[PDB]
Design a protein around this ligand. Structure first.
Ligand SMILES: C1C[C@@H](CNC2CC2)CO1
Length: 152
């Protein structure tokens, strides 16, 4: 059958929102009130992959954009990028591995581990207005925990 998707927003555990800041660039900042319309709405697809009670493979597309978060080696390091795709072919149930995150539920929070790069996580900085990035470190001024919000 089709692939199933939900619209949602994400906030880091310090409650910073994610907003598109220039061509292909997600940034995390503290947001409230009018400015909350700036936040990125994801289409979270439930994709093929290794699964357990608390570990669910997803893809993170930007709502009604042919753009996905992906994990690739850049200058020899696992990095997070926004990657464009053929809008005729996405989303799909069998997403390529660079697009797949293991959504892990621990203590009422979510972590997004790269399926491609074990123990590398979607991360934010403690500082305001810095890039969302892939981090291979868990607890060291890098926020790897998020809360999920379901939107209409
Ligand atoms: C989405 C992917 C990431 C790209 N980082 C590179 C510095 C641009 C930031 O937002």
């Amino acid at each position: 059958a089709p692939v199933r998707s939900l619209n949602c927003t994400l906030r880091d555990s310090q409650q910073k929102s994610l907003v598109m800041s220039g061509p292909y660039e997600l940034k995390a900042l503290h947001l409230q009130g009018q400015d909350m319309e700036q936040q990125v709405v994801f289409s979270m697809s439930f994709v093929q992959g290794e699964e357990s009670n608390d570990k669910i493979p997803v893809a993170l597309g930007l709502k009604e954009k042919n753009l996905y978060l992906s994990c690739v080696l850049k200058d020899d390091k696992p990095t997070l990028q926004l990657e464009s795709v053929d809008p005729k072919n996405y989303p799909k149930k069998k997403m390529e591995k660079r697009f797949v995150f293991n959504k892990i539920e621990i203590n009422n929070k979510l972590e997004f581990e790269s399926a491609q790069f074990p123990n590398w996580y979607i991360s934010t900085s403690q500082a305001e207005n810095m890039p969302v990035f892939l981090g291979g470190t868990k607890g060291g001024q890098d926020i790897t925990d998020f809360t999920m919000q379901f939107v209409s």
